[PDB]
Amino acid sequence: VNKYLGPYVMMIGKMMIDMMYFVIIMLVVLMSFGVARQAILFPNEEPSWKLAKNIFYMPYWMIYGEVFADQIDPPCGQLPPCKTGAWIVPAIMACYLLVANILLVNLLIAVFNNTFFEVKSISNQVWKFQRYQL
Amino acid sequence: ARSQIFIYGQQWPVGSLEQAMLDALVLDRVDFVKLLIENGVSMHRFLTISRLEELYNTRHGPSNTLYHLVRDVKKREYPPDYRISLIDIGLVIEYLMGGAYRCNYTRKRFRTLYHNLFEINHFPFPFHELMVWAVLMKRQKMALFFWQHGEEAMAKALVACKLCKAMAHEASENDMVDDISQELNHNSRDFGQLAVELLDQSYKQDEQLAMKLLTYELKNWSNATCLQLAVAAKHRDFIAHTCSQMLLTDMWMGRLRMRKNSGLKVILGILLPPSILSLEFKNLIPLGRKIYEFYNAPIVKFWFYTLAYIGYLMLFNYIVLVKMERWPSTQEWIVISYIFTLGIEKMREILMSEPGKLLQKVKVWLQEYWNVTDLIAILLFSVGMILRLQDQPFRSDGRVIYCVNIIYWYIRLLDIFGVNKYLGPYVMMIGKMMIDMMYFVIIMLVVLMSFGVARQAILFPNEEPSWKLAKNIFYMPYWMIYGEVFADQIDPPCGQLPPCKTGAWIVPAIMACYLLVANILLVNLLIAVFNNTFFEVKSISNQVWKFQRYQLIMTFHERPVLPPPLIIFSHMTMIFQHLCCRWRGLKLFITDDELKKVHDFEEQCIEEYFREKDDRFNSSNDERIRVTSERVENMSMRLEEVNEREHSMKASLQTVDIRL
Amino acid sequence: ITDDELKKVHDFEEQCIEEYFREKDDRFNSSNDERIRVTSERVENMSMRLEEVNEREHSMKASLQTVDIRL
Amino acid sequence: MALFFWQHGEEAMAKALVACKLCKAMAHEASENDMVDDISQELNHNSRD
C-alpha cells in the first residue's frame, strides 16, 4: 500500500514472466545435464521412479552454491572400478556449470535492467492509480 | 543543350543520337540521359547486345569493381580480359546473388540465341538489365533514374539491394578501403529504404493489389517472387512490414480460418481427432476435404511434428537410463527408426533443392548451421548403434555415444522452442552473448591456468612426468568460480601431520588474488557486456523474429504430412505415386491482364511516392528558410531600384509641375 | 447534486473547454513552424506584387517622360 | 466527427472518459478478433486522444 514498497511489489509482478522464460531455458539445459549424468555414471538400473528424482536433485542445487565436489569424478579403480565413460562427466558438468551460472543468469540481469528502465517510469503513477481501489 | 542545341528544326542526323546516348551513359551523365530520352530516343531501340557489351566494356566513369569480380568468377568456374562478355557478368550475378537466381544471360536458351552472333538483339524490358549495369558499376543516381523509368520496380529494388549488399561483402572480403564498403552498404540501405517506402505506399493505396504485387511470379527476374528475393536479400525490414506478416499469417494458418486461441484449439484438434468438425475453414467430400485441409496447414505440421519430437525425447530418455540387454528394446527400435527416417528426410531435402548441381545443393544446405549439426548428430548416433549391436566392451562405449547424442537433441528442443515470439528473442540473445563469453573464456583461461600451475608447483614439490598434473592444474581453481572454495584443502595444518613444503604460505595469497580477479572482475565484466549487448538486441527484437518466421513458414509448408517416426510411409508414396502416375506455395501464377493491373498499380504508387517526397521536401522547414532568404534578397534589390527610380520620379514630377 | 449547482457545473465545463480550444489555437498559431509557413506564403505574395510594381513603375516612367516631352 | 460532437453539447468529461473506454474496448477486442493490426493500433491511438 505504501508509496515505496508497493512499486517494488509491482516490479516483482512484472519480473516473474521474464523469470518464467528463464526457468524454461534453465529446465532444457539442466535436463540435458541430468540425462547425461544419471546414465553415463549409472548404466545398470531397472525402471524406477527414483531415477526421476536423481535427474533433478543433483544438477539443480549446483546453480545455487554447492557444486557437490565430493560426488564429482570419484576415485576410480584403486574402491570399485567405475563406470563406462565416467571421465567425461566433469567436462560436461563444467559446460553445464558455466552456461547455467554465467550466460543465462547474466542475460537475466540484462533483462531485469531493461524492464526496470521500462516500469520505473510507470511505477509512481500506477501506485497513484491503485490507491483508488483500496 | 535543352535551349539551343535541341532547337525547332535542328536537323538531327541518323545514328549519332544513339551514339551520343552511349557516350552520355559511359561518362555517368544522368541528366543528359534524361534530356535525350526526353527527345524520344526509344531506349528499347537503343539496347543492342553489342551496345550493351561495349556499355560494360568502358574504362571511364568511377571505379569499377567488376574487374576483380569477373576474375574471381573465372577462377572459381574452373590479359585485360578484352570484351567482357555478358555471359561472364551474368555469372557475376549468379555468384553475388547466389541461391537459385538463374539469369536470362546465364540460361542456356539465351546462349543459343548468342551463338548466332558469337527486337533482334533488343531486350523487351531494357530498363531491367540497364539497372543491373548501373548497380554493378557503382552508378547510383543512374540507378535511381532507371528505377523511376521502368516496370516491376519492387523487384528491381530488391535485386539492387541484394546485388549491392553482395558487392559490399565481396569488397570487405578483399580488404579494400572502408570507403568502398561503406558506399556499397549505404547504397544498398538506400535501395532497401525505397523498397520499404514503395511497399507501404502500395499498402496505403490498395491492400489486395499489394498482396498480389508481393506474390506474383517474375519471369524476367528468374521465375521467383518478391518474398524470396527479399529473404535472399536479408532485408529484415521488408519482412517486418505488416503486409508480409499478414500474408505469412494467412499462409501459416493455411486453408483453415479458425483463429481463436489457435495453439490450444489445434492441440485439441489433433488429440481426440474428431474435434475438427467444429472448426471453420475458408470457403463424404465435405469431410474428406476438412481432414485434408486440417492435415496440410503449416501450423498442424508444426505442432504434430513437435509432439513427435517430444515423444522421441521421452522415449530416448527411457532408453538411456534403463538397463540395456543384448538385443535392443522396442522403444529403442522406435528411436533408431526416428533417426533413420530423419536422415532420409534430410536426404530427401538435399535432393529437392532448387540449385541444379548437387555440389550447389550440399553447399547451400551446409550454409544452415542446425542442419549440418543434425548431420553429425545422425552420424554419431548410427556409430553408437553399430557399436551397441556388437559385444563387450563396445556396448559401454555405445552407451557413452548415446549420452553424447542426448545432449544434442536437448539442444535441438531449444531450437523447436525458439518460436513463441516471446522466447524466440531469448534464443537470439543467447546466440549473440556466446561470442562475448568466448572472450571471457580466453581471459579466464589464462588467469585460471596461471593459478593452476602455481598451486600445483608450490604444493606438490617432487612429481614425475605424468598427465595427471594438467588435471590438477585445471581441476581445483575452476570450481572456485562457481561456489565451493575447497575449504579443507586451503592452508592445511602442517608442522604440528606432514611438514610444510617450500613456501606453501604463498598459495593462500595467490588464491586470494585469483578469487578476487575471477569472481569480482571478469564475471562482472560479463554482466556489463551482456547488458549493453542486450541493449542493441532489444532494439531489433521482434523485428528479427518476423524475419526468421518466414523460414519456418516455408519449411512447414514444404515438409510432408507425417511426423518423422512414421514419415517413411509418405516417403513410400513419394517413390510410388510420383513414379507411377508421373513416370509412366506462396507463388501465385497470374494472368497477363491482372499482371498489367499490378503494373499500372506500381506506376501509380511509385509516382505517388515521388510526389510525397517532393512535397515533404518543399514543406520541410529548411527549404522554407532557404527560399524566403533568397526571395528577401531579390526583394531587397527590387526595393533598391524602386526607391532610386521613383525618387527620380519625384524630382521629375516636381520639376515638371514647377514649369507648368 | 441539485439542479442549479449542476447548471453552474455545466457552465464551468463549457467555459473550460472553450478556453482550452482557444489556448490550443493560440499555441498552434504561435508555434514556430506555422510562423515559418505563413512568412513563406506572405513573402511569396510580396515578391509577386513587387514585380508587378516594377512593371507598373517602368510604365509610369515612360508616361512621365512623355508628359515632360509635351511640356 | 466524434471530436466535433465532443465540442458541442455538455458533460464533455464524462463523454471523453466513456469514449476512451469504448475505444480501448474495440482495440483489445479487435486484437482478439484478429483483423488487420492497423485498426487495433489506431483504436489504441483513438483511446489515447
Ligand SMILES: CC(C)CCC[C@@H](C)[C@H]1CC[C@H]2[C@@H]3CC=C4C[C@@H](OC(=O)CCC(=O)O)CC[C@]4(C)[C@H]3CC[C@]12C
Ligand atoms: C522429455 C522431457 C521433457 C520429459 C521427461 C522425460 C523423462 C524424465 C521421463 C519420460 C518417461 C518417464 C518414464 C515413464 C515410465 C516409467 C516406468 C516407471 O515404473 C513403474 O512405475 C513401475 C516399474 C515398472 O514396472 O516399470 C518408473 C519410471 C519410468 C521409467 C519413467 C522415468 C522418467 C521418464 C523417462
Ligand SMILES: CC(C)CCC[C@@H](C)[C@H]1CC[C@H]2[C@@H]3CC=C4C[C@@H](OC(=O)CCC(=O)O)CC[C@]4(C)[C@H]3CC[C@]12C
Ligand atoms: C519441469 C518442472 C517444472 C516440473 C516438475 C515436476 C517433476 C519434475 C516432479 C514433480 C513431482 C516429482 C516426483 C515426486 C515423487 C517421486 C517419487 C520418488 O519415488 C521414490 O523415492 C521411490 C519410489 C520409486 O522409485 O518408484 C521418485 C521421485 C518422484 C517420481 C518425483 C520425480 C520428479 C517429479 C515428477
Ligand SMILES: CC(C)CCC[C@@H](C)[C@H]1CC[C@H]2[C@@H]3CC=C4C[C@@H](OC(=O)CCC(=O)O)CC[C@]4(C)[C@H]3CC[C@]12C
Ligand atoms: C575455463 C575452461 C577452459 C574450462 C576449464 C576446465 C576444464 C579444462 C577441466 C575442469 C575439470 C577437468 C576434468 C576433471 C577430471 C577428468 C577425469 C580424468 O580421467 C582420468 O584421470 C581417468 C581415470 C580413470 O581411468 O578412471 C581425465 C581428465 C578430466 C576429464 C579433466 C579434463 C579437464 C577438465 C574438464
Ligand SMILES: CC(C)CCC[C@@H](C)[C@H]1CC[C@H]2[C@@H]3CC=C4C[C@@H](OC(=O)CCC(=O)O)CC[C@]4(C)[C@H]3CC[C@]12C
Ligand atoms: C601453455 C598453456 C597454453 C598450456 C599449459 C601446457 C602444460 C600444462 C603442458 C605442455 C607440455 C606438457 C608436458 C608434455 C609431455 C609430457 C610427457 C608425458 O609422458 C607420458 O605421457 C608418458 C611418457 C611419454 O611417452 O612421454 C606426461 C605429461 C607431460 C609431462 C606434459 C605435462 C603437461 C605439459 C607441461
Ligand SMILES: CC(C)CCC[C@@H](C)[C@H]1CC[C@H]2[C@@H]3CC=C4C[C@@H](OC(=O)CCC(=O)O)CC[C@]4(C)[C@H]3CC[C@]12C
Ligand atoms: C580451450 C579449452 C577447451 C581448453 C581445454 C583443453 C585442456 C584444458 C584439456 C582438454 C583435454 C584434457 C586432458 C584429457 C585427459 C587427460 C588424461 C588424464 O590422465 C589419465 O587419464 C591417466 C593418468 C592419471 O590421471 O593417472 C590427466 C588429465 C588429462 C591430461 C587432461 C588435461 C586437460 C586437457 C588437456
Ligand SMILES: CC(C)CCC[C@@H](C)[C@H]1CC[C@H]2[C@@H]3CC=C4C[C@@H](OC(=O)CCC(=O)O)CC[C@]4(C)[C@H]3CC[C@]12C
Ligand atoms: C583486501 C583483499 C584484497 C585481500 C584480503 C585477504 C588477505 C588479507 C588474507 C586472506 C588469506 C590470508 C593468508 C592466509 C594464510 C597465510 C599463511 C600464513 O603462513 C603460515 O601460517 C605459515 C605456515 C604454518 O603456520 O604452518 C602467512 C599469512 C597468510 C599468507 C595469509 C595472508 C593474508 C591473506 C592473504
